[PDB]
RNA sequence: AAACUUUCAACAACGGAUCUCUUGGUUCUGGCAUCGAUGAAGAACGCAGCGAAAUGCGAUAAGUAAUGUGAAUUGCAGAAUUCCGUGAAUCAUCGAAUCUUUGAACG
RNA sequence: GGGACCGAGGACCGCGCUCUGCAAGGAUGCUGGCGUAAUGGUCACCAGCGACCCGUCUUGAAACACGGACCAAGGAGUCAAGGUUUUGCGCGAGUGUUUGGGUGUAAAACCCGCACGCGUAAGGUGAGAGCUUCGGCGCAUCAUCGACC
RNA sequence: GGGCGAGGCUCCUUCUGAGUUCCCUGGAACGGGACGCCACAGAGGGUGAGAGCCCCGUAUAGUUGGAAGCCAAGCCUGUGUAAAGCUCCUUCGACGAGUCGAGUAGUUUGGGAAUGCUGCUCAAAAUGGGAGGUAAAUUUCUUCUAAAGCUAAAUACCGGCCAGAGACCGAUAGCGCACAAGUAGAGUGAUCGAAAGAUGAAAAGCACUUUGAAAAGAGGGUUAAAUAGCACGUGAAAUUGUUGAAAGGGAAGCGCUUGUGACCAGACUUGCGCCCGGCGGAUCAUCCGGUGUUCUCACCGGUGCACUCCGCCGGGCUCAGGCCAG
């Protein structure tokens, strides 16, 4: 399993390093991130009438 | 038609694998598939493992199961044979089931790069009606 | 990040999808020898002569 | 940003209050900063301004004109600073108003009240100061 | 895996933030692209082997992508600033571009774009005086 | 179906996240008053009557008086330590005196109960 | 040739579109429960140094007491306030008052 | 032999021949004037030729009939509920978090208990896409023969 | 069991961060460039233009003073053979009438076992009465007590006292009403019911002179702007006037094509290479050290010292250069 590194408040490493969580290989479907997200802005709306 | 309908972007890459495969290969293995590949949803049925059971009961084992569809799961087969199947998508069900059994899991890119002519493929659809 | 794993597993109902591919380089895929050794050669170029 | 209920952020609501705000109300809003020395005097940044006061102006067209405040017309939110007038047509010299926060306050008409007022702001930068500090 | 150069590419073909078209033609703003167009060949940022050249005090300075530090971005470029004769900088970009099989396509746009900056950098000669022309303007 | 008038009788429910807040602050409320105290009554557990969900069962209104008695707990001291006493249900069975006598019993061993003033 | 009729331009008219603005509206949500015989809601007449309306008030009449703030109001005139003070203000708050004729209206 | 209109493509490849290269898979070579309103363009007008005033309605079609003084702004297949067809997406014998509860950076986003809605609890021959070790295997489905509730 | 009660919780209240630093444009910086600083505060508003640090506010904890409800550590007392809960039993155990019910009429409901209600006629019971279950052998069984009464919460809300928001509308829109709007006005009356926002940062809203009866006009002045004159931001079209150009023997307008006149956009202005000279310089080839990288390519420092490399100038030559033509 690939691994990354992390840095500390210096900005240097600190020879900390810890797996990558498996999350980063889902596929990456744009389809699926603006169907989802068009319906997820309208969730935030507050109703206009005459 | 030209463009797929679909608008996944792994679709269109293995479009694009095989528009290639069936433009510079002879195999009318890779024309069906690429047809396959452009059909929509109510035309791509849903293949489950009891069927391709059925179909390696005679010597047709030993021979890639090649789905262009999504392969499910039957609650009715008590027992699933060792089997090599090549699909676009498993269900959660189903993969466990194959794996269990002692069987592998391809995807489409998986069988061109494998078997680019698609030697000793048995190729199945469901059931339309 | 550690707690990153756990948090897609407590998700009940869901799984990590399985990509409809295995290698999204097709660069690898096309140029590979297990396909170029099955290859028909070429009828063309990229560009053809106009003849008449 | 905002987080209490009671606060509103609304444009036409705080413009609603600022041009139909009452007379104390305008008092506060007319409010001029200290000069350097009294700053360092007082530990107190900003006043709300006088009648005796002594302002120098720093923005605006009569800038560096130094003078004795002589009227804090609350109704047009201005004030009126000794010779730094205008000629009318008739060669009439009438006064033009300035903003309170474009001048600095450089001399205050010290009475008890006033004095209060310094104490009361010097005693809360302090007490934060301290409590910033231990 | 998931990610490659052709995905990046379904993704970011009809939108990016380096996107600038109208009418005429479709531009990039990517200081990896090199000839400034939106395709395949040339997207810098899309692609895992890719090249760029921006102007320096005097000379061109010419950025590589490192495939091996493809996730560390302040160590993902190999720069080199050539301040020298123009046939030397020619000759090297043209090295770098396809001695090694590193983009070979991309060797004839690559010394065109060193061509083009230094181009830019010589003293720039003062334009003719316009003439008034006509009966009108002239009058 | 239209055949009425809709118009004039339509219930839209864009105060659902607010009711929520408010039905969650009285809940708060209740626990501020209440401070050591749960803010919900002990109940018995019963079965559902009909044959459809004979196999389920699901919380009643409050305990009867006998299983109450073979419990330990006093009848006017129940509402008083929070909890729900039914006096219209009825045991009927050595089944469902067991349950609750046992439930009862938990709730005694788990109890703190403060000595008055 | 002028005049007249028509076309285009420039400038000037008629008119108030476009653009920008908005102490307004419209809709949703949240906290709370408070009119009147101790005279309500509504109707009228008066009251400012200079006011017609809108606003405020009721013969204590663009208001009195009390509390707080702390030096104004302002279109003009006139006093102010001694400014080291029971203390300006078309100020705010508000627990005390005044409160014409009617109106459920009650000799 | 005498005219007219056109020069399309852009390294080489081909088919051929009158051969130190050719007229053979599309124009080159030499020269002159000008290098600015000269070509070109836009308006205004004259001249030659062409050319009913729009829309609606009726009808096989016209004709009749109706609307039209001019300009600016406004102005007409929308929303909801319930059905239905097709395309995309997720999961798939299951699917649906959002009645409600739990957090929250507070009408968002994130998570979920028990129920509940809809659905679910066997081949041959003519063939037939496809594979083949080229002997045969043969998806779905049609004609028919089928097997069962 | 009574009475005091520190203190506490709500809610109004005072106080609490940091630039008006230096240049330039500008009538005015709140613009741009540079240098900073604060931030549990970079919500909003005002200030002569887009301001976290000019001003009010904004964030978080404290800190002054006050109002009313409620809670409350504790401190005083209590009292009367006073009240209360359970247990047991050779003793008792009162439960709603012109109301149920039957008949009828009307109305209502998904509901003639009348679903409910009301009127009229008749008018009850006490191991009773009501509603159900049941072919199961007789009304077996099940479950409740009507004709008296009270009671918070979860529920509704176009009004009342406020508060916060919006993928809403932006003066023919949004409420009829952004304005002295349910006003002006109309009707005998019930009622009907408009139109109408914007100078400028600041009135600085034309001093004075001159013509005119006056209204007004012209000079002059205010302003950054009178191309902002309270017939006031910007100021379209219909329609009108003046000036400039033109056309017109019973319609104009339109299409194709030249011409005349008026007015215009381009294009071009030279670039590349080579060869002779003359200057100014050594990032010339090679080699040696470090670094990187694509692992064989580069960069940097030295060596390089001048038939090599790079700029500039002065000549000559080639090629390519615009429009119309032969």
């Known amino acids: 399993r690939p691994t990354v590194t992390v840095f500390g408040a210096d900005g240097k490493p600190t020879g900390a390093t810890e797996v990558l969580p498996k999350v980063f290989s889902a596929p990456i479907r744009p389809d699926i991130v603006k169907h989802v997200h068009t319906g997820m802005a309208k969730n935030k709306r507050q109703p206009y009438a005459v | 038609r030209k463009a797929p309908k679909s608008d996944n972007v792994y679709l269109k890459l293995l479009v694009k694998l095989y528009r290639f495969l069936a433009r510079r290969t002879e195999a009318p293995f890779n024309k069906v598939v690429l047809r396959r590949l452009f059909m929509s949803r109510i035309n791509r049925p849903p293949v489950s493992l009891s069927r391709i059971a059925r179909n390696l009961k005679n010597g047709n084992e030993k021979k890639t199961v090649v789905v262009v569809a999504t392969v499910t799961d039957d609650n009715r087969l008590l027992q699933v044979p060792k089997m090599e199947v090549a699909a676009l998508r498993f269900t959660a069900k189903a993969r466990a089931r194959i794996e269990a059994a002692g069987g592998r899991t391809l995807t489409l890119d998986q069988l061109a790069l494998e078997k680019p002519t698609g030697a000793n493929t048995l190729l199945l659809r469901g059931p339309k009606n | 990040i550690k707690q990153l794993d756990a948090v897609y597993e407590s998700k009940k109902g869901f799984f990590l999808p399985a990509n409809i591919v295995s290698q999204a380089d097709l660069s690898r895929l096309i140029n590979s020898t297990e396909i170029q050794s099955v290859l028909r050669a070429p009828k063309g170029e990229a560009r053809t002569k106009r003849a008449c | 940003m905002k987080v209490r209920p009671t606060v509103s952020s609304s444009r036409r609501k705080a413009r609603k209050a600022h041009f139909s705000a009452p007379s104390s109300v305008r008092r506060v809003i007319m409010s001029a900063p200290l000069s350097k020395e009294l700053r360092e005097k007082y530990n107190v940044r900003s006043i709300p301004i006088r009648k005796g006061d002594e302002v120098q102006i720093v923005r605006g067209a009569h800038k560096d004109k130094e003078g004795k405040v002589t009227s804090v017309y609350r109704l047009k939110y201005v004030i009126h600073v000794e010779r730094v007038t205008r000629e009318k047509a008739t060669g009439q010299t009438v006064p033009i108003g300035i903003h309170p926060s474009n001048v600095v306050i450089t001399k205050l008409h010290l009475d008890k009240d006033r004095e209060n007022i310094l104490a009361r702001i010097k005693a809360g930068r302090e007490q934060v100061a301290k409590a910033k500090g231990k | 895996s998931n990610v490659s150069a052709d995905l990046i590419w379904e993704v970011s073909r009809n939108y990016n933030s380096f996107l600038v078209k109208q009418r005429t033609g479709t531009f990039s703003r990517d200081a990896l692209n090199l000839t400034n167009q939106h395709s395949r060949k040339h997207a810098g940022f899309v692609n895992d082997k890719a090249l760029g050249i921006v102007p320096a005090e005097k000379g061109v300075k010419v950025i590589a992508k490192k495939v091996k530090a493809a996730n560390k971005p302040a160590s993902s470029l190999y720069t080199v600033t050539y301040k020298s004769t123009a046939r030397k900088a020619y000759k090297a970009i043209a090295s770098q571009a396809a001695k090694h099989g590193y983009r070979a396509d991309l060797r004839q746009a690559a010394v065109a774009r060193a061509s083009a900056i230094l181009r830019s950098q010589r003293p720039v000669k003062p334009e003719p005086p316009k003439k008034l022309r006509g009966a009108a303007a002239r009058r | ?117």
Not at chain 6, 2 to 24: A, E, I, L, N
Not at chain 6, 51 to 67: D, H, I, S
């Open chain 6, 1 to 117: 179906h239209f055949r009425k008038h809709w118009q004039r009788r339509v219930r839209c429910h864009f105060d659902q996240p607010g009711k929520k807040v408010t039905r969650r602050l009285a809940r708060r409320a209740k626990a501020a008053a209440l401070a050591p105290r749960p803010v919900d009554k002990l109940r018995p557990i019963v079965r559902c009557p009909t044959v459809k969900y004979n196999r389920r069962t699901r919380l009643g209104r409050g305990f009867t008086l006998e299983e109450l008695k073979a419990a330990g707990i006093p009848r006017l001291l129940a509402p008083t330590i929070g909890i729900a006493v039914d006096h219209r249900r009825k045991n009927l069975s050595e089944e469902s005196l067991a349950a609750n006598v046992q439930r009862l019993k938990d709730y005694k061993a788990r109890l703190i109960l403060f000595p008055r003033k």
